[PDB]
């Protein structure tokens, strides 16, 4: 069967390999799957590379040869320097020979581009190993061979392109700093000869496939070569004329010219400025004559999506925006360059009408760059007056929903600038757009929404007087638009847009109380409308206006008998009678915003009392019944009522913060008693029904009560200003109600929200409750750790909140860990290292931070027994655990913090901050410094973990690492160099001197 190729005691049956390969690539189903596993096992055989010569010579399947080169690639990349020197020469020879022969056969060259490209990349892998030190003739001979054959010349452009990519574009993470610099300098040293070949090909035609490959390589060169190669030769003229006319070369040429626009160029040289103008002029001329005139409908062209039109229009946008963002000042003073400047921007206007989100964001970024400059730079805005006028319409017509959020903010930013640049033109465009809604020529739900977002987005730009007439005009026109429509589907859309606009102009509302009052009362009416969405709109608009105009609700206005907040509260039952609970909470939250602006404490608490009258009365009755009949909580309707009362308190506490304390005090004691009663019911249900009870609506409803209670307490404490009351009134009842219940429930019934609440308690008053913190640890530490230390996935919320809590305890009440018994402190260390190994960012980051903070906590204690025992017990544990995640290739997200932790650990010994020997006195001569022993320990650790490294590599790495432990950036470079070297054999130990 197919598995015969895995038997290397027999000659490789090439025909069988070709069958396996064919079955994989062209087959299907179960056969394809079996072949895939066979091929992977073949490829991974560490001796498979020996049979690559046979496959490349005798196979007739190009995919088989591709896999043969992948096998060689792995060998060259990872084990090249371990080979006998004869195999290195041999492999180089038959890779070169294979490429030569494929290029000499026009049919193979034509039809096996995939295999040739793969062979070229394999050659480049060899060059990275061997060149130039053991292949000095490569470039001179490459240039010579290019002249004898168009196919070889074209393929050499592919080799050079890949070489440039591997050395300059993709070297940072794949080779050491020293080796990258060596290859970069080697290419720079011989680029003069490379450019000469490249320019000769471009100048003398004439095979387009050869030209295209040459331009592809030039694109790569432009990333790094000095500008003189581009500005002291004729190449700009060729790029911006010759190669723009032919579509074959047009795409790559435009990309080259975009990168030319990014070259490092001296900006006080007049000749160079003229060259930069000139190639832009040439390029725009070629576009207008060979591709499309300035007037062309690029929106329609892009939508038709013929051939490569979309990529070309994308690339033209990139070219124009890139060049103009850097160089448009070159075109703004010379009157003979004005048409070029405006034609380029007119193309951008046309490109900005294309329906393509990501392209629009690219052009919008440029427009922002432009209008910001016109806003600040003297004497520029008049140049672009007609461009900006068109842009106003483009952005208005493409405004997206505010709350896509990012795009709205970017559009708003540009439109605000455009409004300052010409307030009159902006207003006229918007009024005119509104007229076309009323006359039906452009009426649609989407169209009126888009215009209302645009109108709302420029609030705060116009003068208050103009704004006032503007707002009046818009609302008048919008009211008329709503009146003329029928069906209530149409009237709903327009009424919402009316409310959206007024909500965006708080300055107008604050100046016209009678208007503001009328808006609110009409919002209250809409809170009774059943039409889908009207109620959410009314509540959203209400709190939005309140957040911006709160002062006008809390003072007594002229002609009024009382502050309007009193009037809202008087009628709250009626106003909110038809609202869903979530909407009621928003309404109450809005009222709390107003109440908190009342500076008189007695008035503020009175308003708070009146606001909470309905929830407090429902609360009092329930507490009276729940206490008399704990059975009533089995009623799902009572549970839902209780949860909504608490949620209402959460909502008001969210807006009032510290000022909420009197209401919290009204419910606090009965609320915690309810927490206990609900807790008993949850436990009783789990006991009677099993763990599945936690899935039931009844228990989920009960746990919602517990979670909302915790959220209410957490919300208040996070905002409290009187911390004496928190400690003396709130904390002890809280801990008594929550901690033992958490500890003594089965894991599936424990609420992670308990941990979250305790994190806030510790954060805010931890420094004042040392014994309370100890009690928190005793109740949650060991039992939570046991939930999360068997895998990385179970109990994901407990896992995250667990390390947040340890983090803050370690920050604010480190003494609580000092009190732990030794066995429990060991679990603490175990838990931290466990966090290191998480791929979960929400855990790994806190684990690395806890470790760092812990080391600093220990350091602060000075030379005392606890710190001395800590280092003796745990220093090398933290060193080796940090090294493990640094080097195992599965925790790259934490590299920076791992490096920081390791540097802190090493610098402790380097600074002699550990006052006791880290070794056992029987282990090394007495008096040996911890510095020496650290070097030995690390050398032995790395020799056993990475046995393929030479002793010299390890010693040089550690020598560099330890003297760089004060310079983080350099320290990290040395670690990255180490991560490169451990992936291969024979890394150069002198690489670690790169810094020096």
């Amino acid at each position: 069967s197919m598995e015969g190729i895995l038997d290397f005691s027999n000659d490789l049956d090439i025909a069988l390999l070709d069958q396996v390969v064919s079955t994989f690539y062209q087959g299907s189903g179960v056969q394809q799957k079996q072949a895939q596993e066979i091929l992977t096992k073949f490829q991974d055989n560490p001796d498979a590379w020996q049979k690559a010569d046979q496959i490349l010579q005798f196979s007739t399947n190009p995919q088989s040869k591709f896999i043969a080169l992948s096998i060689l690639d792995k060998l060259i990349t990872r084990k090249w320097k371990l080979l006998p020197n004869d195999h290195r020469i041999g492999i180089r020879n038959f890779v070169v020979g294979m490429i030569i022969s494929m290029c000499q056969d026009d049919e193979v060259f034509k039809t096996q581009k995939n295999l040739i490209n793969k062979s070229d990349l394999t050659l480049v892998q060899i060059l990275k190993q061997e060149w130039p030190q053991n292949w000095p003739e490569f470039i001179p001979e490459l240039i010579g061979s290019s002249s004898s054959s168009v196919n070889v010349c074209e393929n050499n452009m592919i080799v050079l392109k890949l070489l440039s990519e591997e050395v300059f574009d993709f070297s940072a993470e794949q080779m050491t700093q020293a080796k990258a610099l060596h290859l970069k300098n080697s290419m720079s040293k011989e680029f003069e000869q490379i450019f000469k070949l490249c320019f000769q090909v471009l100048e003398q035609g004439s095979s387009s496939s050869l030209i295209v490959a040459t331009l592809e390589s030039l694109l790569r060169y432009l990333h790094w070569i000095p500008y003189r190669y581009i500005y002291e030769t004729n190449i700009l003229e060729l790029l911006s004329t010759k190669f723009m006319t032919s579509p074959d070369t047009r795409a790559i040429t435009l990309k080259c010219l975009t990168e030319v626009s990014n070259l490092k160029i001296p900006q006080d040289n007049d000749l160079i400025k003229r060259q930069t103008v000139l190639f832009f002029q040439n390029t725009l001329q070629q576009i207008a004559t060979s591709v499309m005139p300035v007037t062309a409908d690029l929106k329609a062209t892009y939508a038709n999506a013929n051939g490569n039109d979309q990529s070309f229009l994308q690339d033209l946008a990139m070219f124009l925006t890139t060049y103009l963002a850097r160089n448009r000042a070159l075109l703004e003073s010379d009157e003979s360059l004005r048409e070029l400047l405006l034609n380029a921007h007119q193309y951008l206007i046309q490109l900005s009408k294309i329906e393509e989100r990501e392209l629009f964001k690219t052009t919008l970024d440029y427009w922002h760059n432009l209008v910001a400059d016109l806003f600040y730079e003297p004497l520029k805005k008049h140049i672009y007056e007609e461009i900006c006028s068109q842009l106003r319409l483009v952005i208005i017509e493409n405004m997206v929903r505010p709350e896509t959020i990012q795009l709205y903010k970017s559009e708003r930013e540009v439109l605000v600038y455009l409004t300052h640049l010409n307030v009159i033109d902006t207003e006229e465009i918007m009024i005119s757009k509104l007229a076309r809604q009323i006359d039906g020529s452009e009426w649609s739900w989407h169209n009126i929404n888009t215009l209302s977002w645009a109108i709302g987005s420029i609030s705060g730009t116009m003068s208050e007087d103009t704004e006032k007439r503007f707002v009046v005009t818009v609302i008048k026109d919008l009211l008329g638009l709503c009146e003329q429509k029928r069906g209530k589907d149409n009237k709903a859309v327009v009424a919402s847009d009316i409310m959206y606009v007024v909500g965006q102009y708080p300055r107008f509302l604050k100046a016209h109380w009678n208007f503001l009052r009328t808006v609110i009362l009409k919002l209250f009416e809409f809170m009774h409308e059943t039409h889908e969405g009207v109620q959410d709109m009314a509540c959203d608009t209400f709190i939005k206006i309140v957040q911006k105009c709160k002062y006008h609700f809390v003072i007594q206005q002229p002609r009024e008998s009382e502050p309007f907040i009193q009037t809202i509260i008087r009628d709250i039952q009626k106003t909110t009678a038809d609202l869903q609970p979530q909407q009621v909470h928003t309404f109450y939250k809005a009222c709390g915003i107003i109440i908190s602006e009342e500076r008189s404490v007695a008035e503020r608490n009175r308003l708070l009392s009146d606001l909470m009258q309905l929830p407090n009365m429902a609360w009092d009755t329930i507490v009276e019944q729940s206490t008399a009949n704990p059975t009533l909580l089995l009623d799902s309707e009572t549970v839902k009522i209780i949860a909504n009362i608490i949620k209402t308190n959460v909502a008001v506490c969210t807006s009032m913060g510290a000022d909420f304390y009197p209401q919290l005090g009204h419910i606090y004691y009965n609320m915690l008693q309810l927490y206990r009663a609900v807790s008993s019911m949850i436990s009783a249900q789990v006991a009677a029904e099993g763990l599945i009870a936690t899935k039931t609506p009844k228990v989920r409803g009960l746990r919602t009560i517990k979670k909302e209670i915790l959220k209410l307490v957490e919300t208040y404490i996070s905002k409290a200003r009187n911390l004496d009351d928190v400690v003396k009134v709130l904390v002890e009842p809280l801990l008594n109600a929550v901690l033992e219940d958490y500890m003594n429930n089965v894991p599936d019934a424990r609420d992670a929200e308990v941990l979250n609440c305790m994190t806030t308690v510790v954060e805010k008053v931890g420094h004042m409750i040392p014994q309370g913190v100890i009690l928190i640890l005793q109740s949650v530490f060991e039992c939570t750790l046991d939930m999360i230390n068997k895998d990385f996935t179970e109990y994901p919320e407990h896992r995250v909140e667990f390390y947040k809590l340890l983090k803050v305890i370690n920050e604010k009440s480190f003494a609580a860990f000092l009190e732990l018994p030794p066995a429990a402190f060991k679990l603490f260390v175990d838990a931290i290292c466990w966090a290191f190994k998480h791929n979960n960012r929400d855990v790994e980051v806190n684990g690395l931070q806890i470790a760092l903070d812990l080391v600093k906590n220990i350091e602060r204690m000075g030379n005392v027994p606890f710190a001395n025992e800590f280092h003796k017990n745990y220093f090398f544990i933290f060193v080796s655990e940090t090294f493990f995640v640094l080097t195992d290739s599965d925790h790259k997200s934490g590299f920076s913090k791992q490096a920081l932790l390791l540097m802190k650990l090493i610098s402790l010994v380097y600074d002699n901050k550990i006052s006791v020997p880290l070794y056992q006195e029987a282990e090394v001569p007495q008096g040996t410094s911890n510095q020496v022993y650290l070097s030995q320990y690390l050398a032995n650790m790395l020799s056993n973990a990475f046995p393929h490294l030479t002793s010299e590599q390890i010693a040089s790495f550690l020598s560099a690492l330890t003297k760089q432990c004060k310079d983080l950036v350099v320290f990290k470079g040395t670690l990255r160099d180490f991560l490169v070297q451990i992936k291969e054999v024979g890394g150069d130990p002198t690489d670690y001197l790169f810094a020096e």
């Binding site: 009046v472 609302i475 008048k476 009211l479 709503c482 009146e483 009237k491 009424a495 009316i498 016209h512 009678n514 208007f515 009328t518 808006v519 009362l521 009409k522």
Partner: peptide, 11 residues
């Protein structure tokens, strides 16, 4: 300003 109020309420 006041002519809007009446129109506003009839929505």
């Amino acid at each position: 300003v006041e002519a809007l109020l009446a129109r506003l309420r009839a929505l």
